[PDB]
Amino acid sequence: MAMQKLFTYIYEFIEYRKMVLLEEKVPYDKFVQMVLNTGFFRINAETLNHGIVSVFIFGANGKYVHHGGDMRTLLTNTLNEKKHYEELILIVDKPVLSKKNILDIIVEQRAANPTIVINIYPYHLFCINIPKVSAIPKHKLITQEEAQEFLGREYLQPQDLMQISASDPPVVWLGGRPGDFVQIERPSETAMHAVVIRFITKSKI
Amino acid sequence: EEIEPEENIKRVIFFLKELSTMYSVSPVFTSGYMPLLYDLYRAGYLEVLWNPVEQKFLQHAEQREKEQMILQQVDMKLTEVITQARQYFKI
Amino acid sequence: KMSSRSGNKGIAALALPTSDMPFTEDGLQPDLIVNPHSHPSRMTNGQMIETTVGLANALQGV
Amino acid sequence: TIRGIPGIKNANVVKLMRHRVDAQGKLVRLDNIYAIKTNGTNIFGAMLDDNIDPYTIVSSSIGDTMELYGIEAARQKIISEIRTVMGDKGPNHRHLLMYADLMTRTGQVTSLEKAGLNAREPSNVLLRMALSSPVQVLTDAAVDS
Amino acid sequence: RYAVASYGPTDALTGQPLDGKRSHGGLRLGEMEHWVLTAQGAMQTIIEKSHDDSDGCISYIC
Amino acid sequence: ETNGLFQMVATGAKGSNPNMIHIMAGIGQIEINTQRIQPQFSFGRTLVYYPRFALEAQAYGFICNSYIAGLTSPEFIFGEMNGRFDLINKALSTSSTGYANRKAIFGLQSCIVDYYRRVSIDTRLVQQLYGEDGLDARQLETVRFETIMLSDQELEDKFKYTGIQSPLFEEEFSRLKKDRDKYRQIFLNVENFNFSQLLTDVRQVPVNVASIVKNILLSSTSGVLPFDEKSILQKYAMVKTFCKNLPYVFINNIQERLQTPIPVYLKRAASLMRMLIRIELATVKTLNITCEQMSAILDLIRLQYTQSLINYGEAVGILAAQSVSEPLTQYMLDSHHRS
Amino acid sequence: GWYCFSWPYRVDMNRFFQFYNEMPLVKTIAHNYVIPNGLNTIVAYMIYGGYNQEDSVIVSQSFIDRGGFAGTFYREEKVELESDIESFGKPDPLITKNLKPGANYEKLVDGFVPVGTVVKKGDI
Amino acid sequence: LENPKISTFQMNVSACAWYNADFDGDQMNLWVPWSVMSRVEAELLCSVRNWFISTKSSGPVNGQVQDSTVGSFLLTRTNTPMGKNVMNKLHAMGLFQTTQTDPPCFANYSPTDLLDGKSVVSMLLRQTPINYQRAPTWYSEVYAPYMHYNKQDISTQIRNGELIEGVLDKKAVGAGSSGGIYHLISRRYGPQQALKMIFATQQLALNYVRNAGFTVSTADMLLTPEAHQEVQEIINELLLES
Amino acid sequence: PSIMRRLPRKEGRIRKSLLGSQVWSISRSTICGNSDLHLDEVG
Amino acid sequence: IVESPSICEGFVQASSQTLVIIPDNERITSNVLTTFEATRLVAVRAQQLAINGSTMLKKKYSSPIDIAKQELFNRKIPLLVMRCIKVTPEGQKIVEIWNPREMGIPLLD
Known part of the structure; x- marks a missing residue:
């Protein structure tokens, strides 16, 4: 029942990022029909700075995840359009993450476009409202100035803090990029709660 | 850059000043009152802060110093006697 | 280190003269004094039964 | 797969106790709460079920919690799992944080073995030499300058 | 029982005392004891035992 | 009143209830790895003394006799089967624990508390604050929190002061109430991502604030104080200011005088201490305390709070490894009581 | 105990020959084939001063002087x-x-x- | 130890909890610091008083073990098989002749005056007054139906050092007992002061037994013939269900 | 015999000569019970 | 083209450092000696007394340890505690200088 969870929590994820939808919503049956016919479903949103985020949801048995050429031509056709792109979210089945060729096209597209963030994610990262999970503490991106003040007070460097990957699910939902700082408020059985600051690093794919 | 303590701490520092010539305590004038707190805790008598019964602890410290001096002098006399006797027996 | 036949080993700790050891009304006094707390956790019941049987054997001469 | 979710071989029913704030603000212990304790772990499998609350899925697997929830939830999972092993005559809580905070300081759950030490402390050769195999570490240190 | 000295037979290679009572050497402050002394913060004790009493020397480095 | 064996067990000096039952009543079922004696003697026989596919419970380790009555040959063999496991697991409780102890220390030993009470590896933070509270394990007191289990009506019955009609005491109860909610919200969430970790109104705090108030009240010659409006208002201001400057215990007295901004992670460290102080120094609980005695309580609270702070340069990584790898000896000793 | 019946003819290392041995008042079938090693010490199961705690024992000094568990120990x-x-x-x-x-x-x-x-x- | 025939390292039994040691044949190392720097740090940092409270479980390590746990119960017990648990002035003074603390004052007592164990324990706890109120290990609802518990032995209450009622056992004076008597003394008076009271209370427990006695026998383990028939009738029910 | 064989195992250079140590001015003996000694005293 | 090694690289001797003392009002470390620092102070003073023996303690004791303890307690110890805060890549060594004559002693006597 993955696709049903995606159909609701991808829009919950878009809302959580404070992005405005561009294309009007469609029923779930039409969504699965498009996923079956075309092989993928495409959602568009615009950021406060008018940056365009396009999220691709790929079927498990689609041609774009088995043939590398299909993914290559799809990404090439999407990346040369007259829109203010800032990120492409490629939601695929988890085994697709293990396919070396697909990741090869992904990294080649990253190299060809140094100003566009290309990310590939499994289904399970968008099947719950991740911030609402009880086991997950409260993450919050902090500005560069606040982090600089904190490090100056503590005589610390960004490389000295704890580090968290940009592919970390709450970091993905926040929208953190490598080089940013995330403040985490977490429960504690000693001081009843604690606050830490982590330095976001590069994603694992 | 401290300027002046409070009346409670004023009388406590007066107590410590009077106790300095009587116990291994030297009063300082830090703003946080903290070395004073450690000195009072180490002396085994933190009751100055709320109970005005400092005089009995002053007498207690005088007494304890008295037995300390008495025992020290007794030990010195004993050890000099032992030294002289051992010298006698060695000769 | 000394031990019984039930596996309750022990280390000699104190050496008392014949007048400091406890004695019965009939004059019997122990050679070893072992803690009663050695038994309940190790359940060496054969040592206690041996003392009960051996106590009657001495008087009966058997 | 027929009539089930992959990864779990047995699913029992247990009685567990929870607190809940009443309408009068009183915190009361609720003893008549039934749940499912399974043998085998699949967070994503039980995630998709409509009969299970997805927000309060408690796994015993650090790797599975790390995969789906993150490093912060994996940090709380290491603390919980060590405490279960420690029993009740166990150490203070601050000693369990030291294990989890060390093992999760790099964004990934490192181990307390030679591979884990090489990730947290790659440049500490002398400590790495003492742990497992000085010859292998010494040879690699020389070529890497 | 054992108690040896401030000095005695010495290992040729490491400069440390010999092993055990049989060789009239010293006793071992092993790996686990330096862990405890470090945990307690006893660092001047480690200098006294592991350096002054075992093999401590002076190394000259340019 | 005269049984030596029973008094050793009943008073906790030595032994337990299963020891007396085994001695006097019966050993019962021998259970290895939470199961009966499996048949390893030629396809369905547990021993040579019992037939194949035996149905009686005695054939599978049920010892019907007690130690005082003696065991038979088959019962002694089954007892030796379980007794040998104790010897085997005791031997493993040394080597297997030692393998895990050494690996834990070599990974954790580099963690040392620096001058910020952080835990770091020579530059690299492992903890922003040691134990997230900055305290020592040897300096902890187990103290109950009153407000946690109370309903909102009886929270107002016990902690709302109605002697003085001032807006200040409305904020005092509101701060008491939302500290109660914050404790509930956090530790109910902790209950959610655990198997059987229930909420408790009892915490390990460095200072037993209730005892200090009780101690001073006893040693004071003043009995029931008369009603004084300014003294009650002054005490509330003293407590509110003390809780505001409480995080300065982690820095020094120099910054407290200068009132420099406190880091966020240090405000969270003193959250439990702030909560307990406002519970035990509530206006209802300090009616018979003078303003001069209140200064002694505040001075004594931060004296004990500073004494419980972790030392600079303490090898806490070795402390944690020793504290965690030691219970593994008992965990390994009970290897035959687990599946 | 009597570690060997031909001890005086032997030059052995770390061997103890206990002078006195007793057949137990409660003997077994194992004593038909080997010599018993020990003594029938009178034992009191009591708390006496706290010197026998934690698996210790209190020994009569007179029992020691009379030859209880006494013998000769050899080295070569x-x-x-x-x-x-x-x-x-x-x-x-x-x-x-x-x-x-x-x-x-x-x-x-x-x-x-x-x-x-x-x-x-x-x-x- | 001036005795030339002693070759062992002797220590108090209550000190074994630090080292997880016992006297079945264990051997322990001992080195005396000689350097001034190492001798200073031994006194200030490595003293055993610094680890009365465990750095592992945040609780006390030391207490009464196996003779002052049952000895304290007998001393603080309300009723003796020979009447009320009292003692004359002569035997009350004899309990304090080994504690190595300053003796109390027995001047306000006739030779025929009787003192109970609670009074004797109180004279020692006045030095470090604490507040303690819990249920002793002696009381257990498992034993309750088949026992007649004394109502003054199931509630151990101490206020300002005065043992008002109850018995002292593993719950109050036992080793590793969190919130116990010696845990409260350490928190209020220092870990060194708690160690002296462990030794001091150990002597009253041992001095009480010097003429009260404690033993275990074979008949302490023997069921009556009528109760043996009840045990196997219970076991036969288990074999009937099986 | 080789130079690198001296390093690895428990009886090796690192774990026997560096992480451990043989010391002088030390004594060992069997321990014993003594109820007249304080908890911070050793016979 | 990355060429052969030169003399600019390959230095083994680390460059010298400049001791940067934090001003008294800008200090962050506690105004209370830790047990480690107090023990180190007492041990150092006792060893130096065993070397020199010159002290201004008014009372008389027959052991360097006792004299050092009383000097620390009477706030007459001629030592300072330097708490190394950070070693900066440019060369500075930021430290904290604390006077044990105006800090709280954690020891007991």
Whole structure:
């Protein structure tokens, strides 16, 4: 029942990022029909700075995840359009993450476009409202100035803090990029709660 | 850059000043009152802060110093006697 | 280190003269004094039964 | 797969106790709460079920919690799992944080073995030499300058 | 029982005392004891035992 | 009143209830790895003394006799089967624990508390604050929190002061109430991502604030104080200011005088201490305390709070490894009581 | 116990010969084939001063003096020679080199200490 | 130890909890610091008083073990098989002749005056007054139906050092007992002061037994013939269900 | 015999000569019970 | 082209450092000696007394340890505690200088 969870929590994820939808919503049956016919479903949103985020949801048995050429031509056709792109979210089945060729096209597209963030994610990262999970503490991106003040007070460097990957699910939902700082408020059985600051690093794919 | 303590701490520092010539305590004038707190805790008598019964602890410290001096002098006399006797027996 | 036949080993700790050891009304006094707390956790019941049987054997001469 | 979710071989029913704030603000212990304790772990499998609350899925697997929830939830999972092993005559809580905070300081759950030490402390050769195999570490240190 | 000295037979290679009572050497402050002394913060004790009493020397480095 | 064996067990000096039952009543079922004696003697026989596919419970380790009555040959063999496991697991409780102890220390030993009470590896933070509270394990007191289990009506019955009609005491109860909610919200969430970790109104705090108030009240010659409006208002201001400057215990007295901004992670460290102080120094609980005695309580609270702070340069990584790898000896000793 | 019936004919290392042994008042079938080793000590199961706590025992001094669990303990010294290089004999201070500090060479008789004398620490 | 025949390292039994040691044949190392720097740090940092409270479980390590746990119960017990648990002035003074603390004052007592164990324990706890109120290990609802518990032995209450009622056992004076008597003394008076009271209370427990006695026998383990028939009738029910 | 064989195992250079140590001015003996000694005293 | 090694690289001797003392009002470390620092102070003073023996303590004791303890307690110890805060890549060594004559002693006597 993955696709049903995606159909609701991808829009919950878009809302959580404070992005405005561009294309009007469609029923779930039409969504699965498009996923079956075309092989993928495409959602568009615009950021406060008018940056365009396009999220691709790929079927498990689609041609774009088995043939590398299909993914290559799809990404090439999407990346040369007259829109203010800032990120492409490629939601695929988890085994697709293990396919070396697909990741090869992904990294080649990253190299060809140094100003566009290309990310590939499994289904399970968008099947719950991740911030609402009880086991997950409260993450919050902090500005560069606040982090600089904190490090100056503590005589610390960004490389000295704890580090968290940009592919970390709450970091993905926040929208953190490598080089940013995330403040985490977490429960504690000693001081009843604690606050830490982590330095976001590069994603694992 | 401290300027002046409070009346409670004023009388406590007066107590410590009077106790300095009587116990291994030297009063300082830090703003946080903290070395004073450690000195009072180490002396085994933190009751100055709320109970005005400092005089009995002053007498207690005088007494304890008295037995300390008495025992020290007794030990010195004993050890000099032992030294002289051992010298006698060695000769 | 000394031990019984039930596996309750022990280390000699104190050496008392014949007048400091406890004695019965009939004059019997122990050679070893072992803690009663050695038994309940190790359940060496054969040592206690041996003392009960051996106590009657001495008087009966058997 | 027929009539089930992959990864779990047995699913029992247990009685567990929870607190809940009443309408009068009183915190009361609720003893008549039934749940499912399974043998085998699949967070994503039980995630998709409509009969299970997805927000309060408690796994015993650090790797599975790390995969789906993150490093912060994996940090709380290491603390919980060590405490279960420690029993009740166990150490203070601050000693369990030291294990989890060390093992999760790099964004990934490192181990307390030679591979884990090489990730947290790659440049500490002398400590790495003492742990497992000085010859292998010494040879690699020389070529890497 | 054992108690040896401030000095005695010495290992040729490491400069440390010999092993055990049989060789009239010293006793071992092993790996686990330096862990405890470090945990307690006893660092001047480690200098006294592991350096002054075992093999401590002076190394000259340019 | 005269049984030596029973008094050793009943008073906790030595032994337990299963020891007396085994001695006097019966050993019962021998259970290895939470199961009966499996048949390893030629396809369905547990021993040579019992037939194949035996149905009686005695054939599978049920010892019907007690130690005082003696065991038979088959019962002694089954007892030796379980007794040998104790010897085997005791031997493993040394080597297997030692393998895990050494690996834990070599990974954790580099963690040392620096001058910020952080835990770091020579530059690299492992903890922003040691134990997230900055305290020592040897300096902890187990103290109950009153407000946690109370309903909102009886929270107002016990902690709302109605002697003085001032807006200040409305904020005092509101701060008491939302500290109660914050404790509930956090530790109910902790209950959610655990198997059987229930909420408790009892915490390990460095200072037993209730005892200090009780101690001073006893040693004071003043009995029931008369009603004084300014003294009650002054005490509330003293407590509110003390809780505001409480995080300065982690820095020094120099910054407290200068009132420099406190880091966020240090405000969270003193959250439990702030909560307990406002519970035990509530206006209802300090009616018979003078303003001069209140200064002694505040001075004594931060004296004990500073004494419980972790030392600079303490090898806490070795402390944690020793504290965690030691219970593994008992965990390994009970290897035959687990599946 | 009686570790060997031919102990005086043997030069053994780290062997203890307990003088007195008793057949247990409650014997077993194992004592039909081996000699019992021990004594029937009178044992009191009591708390007496707290010196027998934590698996300790309190021993009568009189029982010790009378020979309870008393015996003789043996050690051996087997020294070999190098053929025609070394020899057995008392050294002399004015010829031999690096004699052991704080030694006692005067107890040697023709290279060996005579039988029956008490040798203490530092004696050659 | 001036006795030339002693070759062992002797220590108090209550000190074994630090080292997880016992006297079945264990051997322990001992080195005396000689350097001034190492001798200073031994007194200030490595003293055993610094680890009365465990750095592992945050609780006390030391207490009464196996003779002052049952000895304290007998001393603080309300009723003796020979009447009320009292003692004359002569035997009350004899309990304090080994504690190595300053003796109390028995001047306000006739030779025929009787003192109970609670009074004797109180004279020692006045030095470090604490507040303690819990249920002793002696009381257990498992034993309750088949026992007649004394109502003054199931509630151990101490206020300002005065043992008002109850018995002292593993719950109050036992080793590793969190919130116990010696845990409260350490928190209020220092870990060194708690160690002296462990020794001091150990002597009263041992001095009480010097003429009260404690033993275990074979008949302490023997069921009556009527109760043996009840045990196997219970076991036969288990074999009937099986 | 080789130079690198001296390093690895428990009886090796690192774990026997560096992480451990043989020391002088130390004593060992069997321990014993003594109820007249304080908890911070050793016979 | 990355060429052969030169003399600019390959230095083994680390460059010298400049001791940067934090001003008294800008200090962050506690105004209370830790047990480690107090023990180190007492041990150092006792060893120096065993070397020199010159002290201004008015009372008389027959052991360097006792004299050092009383000097620390009477706030007459001629030592300072330097708490190394950070070693900066440019060369500075930021430290904290604390006077044990105006800090709280954690020891007991």
